[PDB]
């Protein structure tokens, strides 16, 4: 395919986020590379406005599912690459149990040879001493299954999953993700049969990075269709 072909090798990534959580404003820039052959994403982010006012792990899902590895028998179900290079809009609402919610709108598209994820994020109704604004999340991440169905209406897909954030007191805080992706271009896209992405992530720190930052590794593989 055409969209497929843009991802046969390593692709550089840029990420830019403008955020407002409970009126608390911030900006993040990140960069790295994706290799959809392995399903691998590696990214580093800094908060360019000072200290991030929310925990880094709450922004992992917001910070490029076109880098998922789709097995060959599933390649006709890969909406994300099929919209490329024109790209897609990715919108979410993320509900933090008994706390506030994020609403995000991103454009994911090629700018030159670089895959760019440009995000606007608005967060409201957070408890000022909740787990999020109180910074009670552990700096880590777990594995999740990302459920994808076509939304033929909108020529795109609808996606839902629940993230498990570990809290420092031993408990777990769920973030209910509702997501829609719609193509930016006018070319045809692949509308998939129901399937899911198996995602796994690991967060770390660059011991030499003086700014508030996050290093993210994601591994993502599609599954749920047989043969």
């Amino acid at each position, epitope marked *: 395919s055409k969209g497929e072909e843009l991802f046969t090798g390593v692709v550089p990534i840029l990420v830019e986020l403008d955020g407002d959580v409970n009126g608390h404003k911030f900006s993040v*820039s990140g960069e790295g590379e994706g290799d959809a052959t392995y399903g691998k994403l590696t990214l580093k982010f800094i908060c*360019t406005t000072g200290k991030l006012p929310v925990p880094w792990p709450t922004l992992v899902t917001t910070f490029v599912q076109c880098f998922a590895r789709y097995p060959d028998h599933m390649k006709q179900h890969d909406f994300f690459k099929s919209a490329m290079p024109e790209g897609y809009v990715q919108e979410r609402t993320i509900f933090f149990k008994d706390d506030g919610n994020y609403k995000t709108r991103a454009e994911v598209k090629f700018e030159g040879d670089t895959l760019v994820n440009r995000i606007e994020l608005k967060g409201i109704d957070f408890k000022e001493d909740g787990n999020i604004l109180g910074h009670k999340l552990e700096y880590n991440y777990n594995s999740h299954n990302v459920y994808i169905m076509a939304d033929k209406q909108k020529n795109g897909i609808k996606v839902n999953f629940k993230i498990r954030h570990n809290i420092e007191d031993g408990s777990v805080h769920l973030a209910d993700h509702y997501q829609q992706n719609t193509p930016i271009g006018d070319g045809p896209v692949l509308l998939p049969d129901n399937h899911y992405l198996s995602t796994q992530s690991a967060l770390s720190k*660059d011991p030499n*990075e*003086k*700014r508030d*930052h996050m290093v993210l590794l994601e591994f993502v593989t599609a599954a749920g269709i047989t043969h």
Partner: nanobody
Amino acid sequence: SMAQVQLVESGGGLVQAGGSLRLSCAASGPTGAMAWFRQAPGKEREFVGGISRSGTDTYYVDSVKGRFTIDRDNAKNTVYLQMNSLKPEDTAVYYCAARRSQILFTSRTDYEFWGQGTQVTVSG
């Protein structure tokens, strides 16, 4: 899109504690974030301050905040470091550094291009 460049440092020199010195650096072509590192004798190269491609993001380590200033000229492909109220502990070999990406990361490992190092000596 950004390419291989060479960095040519000028300025610096010898000064008495409390004085001022200016460093400058000229890239052979356009580049992204630019920064200054320093290596004091028998210590590791360390980040001093830097500036994003656009100039709207700068960052300084705490020990120089308020005394050092950086700015850049994307028309001339240069950057400078104006160092005021210098202290003997500011003595070091200073390196200009750059990267293709616009983003002002601060780890040595994030920088692809390097000047050869310019001596700054502050006499107590």
